[PDB]
């Protein structure tokens, strides 16, 4: 019997890019989930197949806390049955998803004067992402007859693009930190 280390997820100094979203597996802990829903730090707090207020009760074998950073416009794509750059090629939630989607503005944390280009996201992909799939390949696409062989060029694109996180951006283009809680049927409430 240990404590749920959710502090490592929400309070992390740096978040992962959405194409390489992080996943923290949790096992046999306990958490005061009544500390979570009433936190005014969260702007988006949507739970699917389960209610947030009644969360301090259920139990399961493993809860998964996935974290990444997308812009504010793309937060609606972190949801079941959604489409877009993020939902198709970065982070895809299943249709029968059972868990919560938490997100908050991190402009004060992830934006830099002149632009923060550390956060990236997959542009194109061979096929839409399966739910909970992580594609981290950076293979140049030989789009033309001439071979790139890692050499970017004419018909030789790089599959990833950087966000241009500047503080003066619009709220739809500001960075948001997302944490997706998913459950698997040890960890009970208190």
């Amino acid at each position: 019997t240990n404590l749920c280390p959710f502090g490592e997820v929400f309070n992390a100094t740096r978040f992962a890019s959405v194409y390489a979203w992080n996943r923290k597996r949790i096992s046999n802990c306990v958490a005061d989930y009544s500390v979570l829903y009433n936190s005014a730090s969260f702007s988006t707090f949507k739970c699917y197949g389960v209610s947030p207020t009644k969360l301090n009760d259920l139990c399961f074998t493993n809860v998964y806390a996935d974290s990444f950073v997308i812009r504010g416009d793309e937060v609606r794509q972190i949801a079941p049955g959604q489409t877009g750059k993020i939902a198709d090629y970065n982070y895809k939630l299943p249709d029968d998803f059972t868990g919560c989607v938490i997100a908050w503005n991190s402009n004060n944390l992830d934006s830099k004067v002149g632009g923060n280009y550390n956060y990236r996201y997959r542009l194109f992909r061979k096929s839409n992402l399966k739910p909970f799939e992580r594609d981290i390949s950076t293979e140049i696409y030989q789009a033309g007859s001439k071979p790139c062989n890692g050499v970017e060029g004419f018909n030789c694109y790089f599959p990833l693009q950087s966000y241009g996180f500047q503080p003066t951006n619009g709220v739809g283009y500001q960075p948001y930190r997302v944490v997706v809680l998913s459950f698997e049927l040890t960890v009970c409430g208190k």
Partner: antibody
Amino acid sequence: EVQLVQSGAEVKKPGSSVKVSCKASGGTFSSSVISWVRQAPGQGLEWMGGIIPLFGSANYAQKFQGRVTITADESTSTAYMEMTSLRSEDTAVYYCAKVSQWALILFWGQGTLVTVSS
Amino acid sequence: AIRMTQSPGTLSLSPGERATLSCRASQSVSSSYLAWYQQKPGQAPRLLIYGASSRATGIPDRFSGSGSGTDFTLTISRLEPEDFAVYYCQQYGTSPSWTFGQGTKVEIKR
């Protein structure tokens, strides 16, 4: 938000016992690791032990395993650190530190000065 | 138990120089559970870094934490004359089992 308040300074004679309190506010009490750190004058910070008020099982460092009892009270959100058979070497400033399971930051008390002398 | 050792025991630099404080762990420690404190004499310890790299409230951006595994670093880009103290590193976690370093003292050269 969160704040830790400790008891006042104590002047104990050798052989006596002292009990220092640590009132926590902010609602993160039960789901936290509340430790006790001792810093002798001129020396560094020394971790004595800690306890999770949700579990009650206190864990101590080897140096403090015999003379130190660390307890916590959820009904009043107060952690305690009792030490018996006080010696003049026990003269130090005792801080109570708190780590909530929902954060990586650490919350500290203002410190309690316990002077052991006749 | 885990043992935290800092290097150097004393760092002696002039104002404006760069201070590179080290903290070596006997085992691999999660980087999410390493803090750096600044203790001026007669004062309570002041938390500088938590989570190996997050600056506490009010800490200037000349302080930066870094490292992983067993080696961690507290870097002061340009020393101000106020940046003198005894700096400690701390391994903590979600279990009541923490250990501190022995401390590095930064004195001014003048």
